[PDB]
Design a protein around this ligand. Structure first.
Ligand SMILES: Cc1cc2nc3c(=O)[nH]c(=O)nc-3n(C[C@H](O)[C@H](O)[C@H](O)COP(=O)(O)OP(=O)(O)OC[C@H]3O[C@@H](n4cnc5c(N)ncnc54)[C@H](O)[C@@H]3O)c2cc1C
Ligand SMILES: Cc1cc2nc3c(=O)[nH]c(=O)nc-3n(C[C@H](O)[C@H](O)[C@H](O)COP(=O)(O)OP(=O)(O)OC[C@H]3O[C@@H](n4cnc5c(N)ncnc54)[C@H](O)[C@@H]3O)c2cc1C
Ligand SMILES: NC(=O)c1ccc[n+]([C@@H]2O[C@H](COP(=O)([O-])OP(=O)(O)OC[C@H]3O[C@@H](n4cnc5c(N)ncnc54)[C@H](OP(=O)(O)O)[C@@H]3O)[C@@H](O)[C@H]2O)c1
Ligand SMILES: NC(=O)c1ccc[n+]([C@@H]2O[C@H](COP(=O)([O-])OP(=O)(O)OC[C@H]3O[C@@H](n4cnc5c(N)ncnc54)[C@H](OP(=O)(O)O)[C@@H]3O)[C@@H](O)[C@H]2O)c1
Lengths: 303, 303
């Protein structure tokens, strides 16, 4: 009844849907929230070819714009499950079911948690996983950013707009971030570093964060230091709970595909960050999305 | 001496270079002509996520813009050959040599020729492979477009701005183009179709084209009909003459890679249209380019 349903409207899904709709496939694009996915939690995007710098939510709007007009059917849905009946598939949301010949899973990835004490207790009140969302609540604070990759270092640079100081705590003595971003952080006077360390405890009042306890991973030296905010960027977990049962995931829960975005299950493809892969970028989300869209077209034609 | 040299500055190369430069790799981007590659011969681009419609040369300029500032070294060069010495590679242009630890080949693809009589004789004078380049020289003419894929049908639609009429001649009774573009062509009153036919001869004066002879592929019926211009869009050939000897091409001359853009030869990657693949788009050029850039970084780090 749908030719293709695409689950998730971040850049991978939105590219897939644009392409399926241009192949005049009966296209459903389901998204639980706002079109744009992680791009809406990104302040400044500098590496999307075609734009020299653009706010994440502006790029989100631009990618979402033509979809209506191409005839993609955009709809709210939180997908809870998928059933492989052989020549059709059923997608289950909170209130609905949808029948489709093919599915493109584009549901992305989510912030990994530290799993330390205080992390949940201070969720509304000093702990954040999103700088563009929360940063201005930390004006004049001493902010702490945990992690050494692209997200930690970029989001630290952004947060220097608000904080008195921003400190990056990384568990080794070399960052994983792109060298250009590393160099910017090294040069920025409002960024400090706690190398070779991991956080152990986040402490505060009833009402807000006050301090973090942490450990040096080469010596075991333990330190406690005052901070007003903590932003955590320690990696990603897959957002694929609705396919746990299906046999298409690895041990960590990422969706396994071949190089044409095919899973085990014929007619089910996956694209973008939710796939098992090392390189998570808008450019490769877009690429994945287009390739899936073409493979879906062909799968459906063969049917 | 270079960490990476990227050969070709269409969208795959320009994405690769942006990424290598952001990893602070010593980056050379060699291009024989204008940055943009095929995008400069494209009138209107509707399917690049992030832009709802954009002229090909405008998107080319936008992708080229930040490269200087990131520290990519942009240089003229026509590459004639590459030598694999083991821990370095030599790239040979018309006048120069360049030594590099890794190479990303992004040289794209070129118009296939009909190989029929009159095709060369009328090259300056009625035969074209590029509508945005030549179309306004055919104001008020009866134009013929050969082919049934995305290029033929899109470029026919563009050419209706100039021609009295534009006729698409396809060798089957169903187009290969994306359905949205097919439907636009079906509806456009200035587009006619010659189905199930191939051109046999292009005829004219000393000075210009006047007529085409063609054949119906189901009946052998031969017809000759008057046209002022002929635009040929019958597919693509690889632009990889500089690696013929190297053992990295298929029988047709496309560069073979795995899913991380690696060839046989370690430290030589290829991206975008020049690779062996079915799906040639800006989105997948960009994707390829980013993935190559990451793999080059890692190759060079290991070295
Ligand atoms: C802070 C930050 C900065 C970044 N900056 C850059 C950058 O500058 N350049 C760059 O190239 N990359 C950047 N990235 C990486 C990039 O954003 C991602 O690679 C890209 O967004 C992945 O797109 P995607 O479509 O696969 O998933 P996502 O963007 O993750 O979109 C997934 C969508 O699926 C939806 N969804 C999830 N589950 C369900 C469900 N069960 N039912 C319905 N809908 C669902 C979500 O709401 C979401 O909208 C950044 C990442 C972060 C975190
Ligand atoms: C008429 C037309 C319309 C199109 N429209 C669309 C569209 O709307 N959307 C879409 O997604 N895709 C479109 N495409 C496909 C798209 O343009 C290509 O997929 C894309 O440009 C491929 O990029 P690339 O970087 O691999 O190669 P190219 O863009 O082909 O760039 C290759 C570059 O390498 C250079 N080069 C070649 N040989 C050498 C040498 N020996 N030394 C130095 N430099 C060299 C060339 O000058 C060129 O600039 C279109 C194609 C055509 C022909
Ligand atoms: N501009 C961009 O292109 C951009 C921007 C943001 C994100 N992304 C991409 O998105 C993906 C996710 O990025 P990411 O930065 O969120 O995650 P990531 O690449 O997994 O990096 C997580 C970082 O946090 C470190 N870490 C893990 N646990 C820690 C702890 N307990 N204490 C201190 N440090 C710890 C990791 O250490 P190790 O390094 O030791 O593992 C790593 O440096 C990546 O592929 C990334 O390239 C891209
Ligand atoms: N908007 C876009 O995304 C866009 C725009 C342009 C190009 N592209 C991409 O670029 C790549 C190249 O496109 P393309 O259209 O140039 O080439 P293509 O996809 O190979 O199509 C060539 C078309 O010409 C036909 N043909 C071959 N020889 C012929 C002859 N002698 N007489 C009549 N018809 C003949 C082919 O027939 P058969 O179909 O029988 O083989 C085919 O329909 C494709 O992957 C395409 O999708 C994309």
């Amino acid at each position: 009844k749908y030719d293709v349903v695409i689950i998730g409207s971040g850049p991978a899904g939105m590219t897939a849907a644009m392409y399926t709709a241009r192949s005049e496939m009966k296209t459903l694009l389901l998204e639980r929230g706002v079109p744009g996915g992680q791009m809406n939690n990104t302040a400044e995007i500098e590496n999307y070819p075609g734009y020299e710098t653009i706010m994440g939510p502006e790029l989100s709007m631009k990618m979402a714009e033509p979809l209506e007009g191409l005839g993609v059917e955009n709809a709210y849905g939180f997908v809870t499950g998928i059933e492989d009946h052989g020549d059709y598939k059923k997608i289950i949301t909170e209130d609905d079911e949808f029948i489709t010949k093919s599915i493109i899973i584009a549901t992305g990835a989510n912030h990994r948690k530290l799993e330390i004490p205080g992390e949940e207790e201070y969720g509304a009140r000093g702990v954040s996983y999103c700088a563009v969302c929360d940063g201005a609540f930390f004006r004049n604070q001493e902010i702490l950013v945990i992690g050494g990759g692209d997200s930690a270092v970029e989001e630290a640079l952004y947060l220097t707009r608000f904080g008195q100081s921003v400190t990056i705590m990384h568990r080794r003595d070399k960052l994983r971030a792109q060298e250009i971003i590393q160099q910017r952080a090294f040069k920025e006077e409002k960024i400090n570093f706690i190398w070779d360390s991991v956080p152990m405890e986040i402490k505060g009042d009833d009402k807000k964060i006050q301090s973090v306890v942490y450990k040096n991973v080469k010596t075991g030296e333990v330190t406690e230091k005052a901070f007003g905010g903590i932003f955590i960027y320690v990696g990603l977990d897959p957002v694929a709970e609705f396919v746990s049962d299906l046999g298409i995931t690895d041990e960590a829960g990422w969706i396994i595909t071949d190089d044409h975005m095919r899973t085990n299950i014929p007619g089910i493809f996956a694209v973008g960050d939710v796939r098992q892969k090392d390189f998570r970028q808008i450019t490769t989300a877009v690429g994945d999305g287009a390739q899936a869209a073409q493979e879906a077209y062909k799968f459906v034609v063969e049917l």
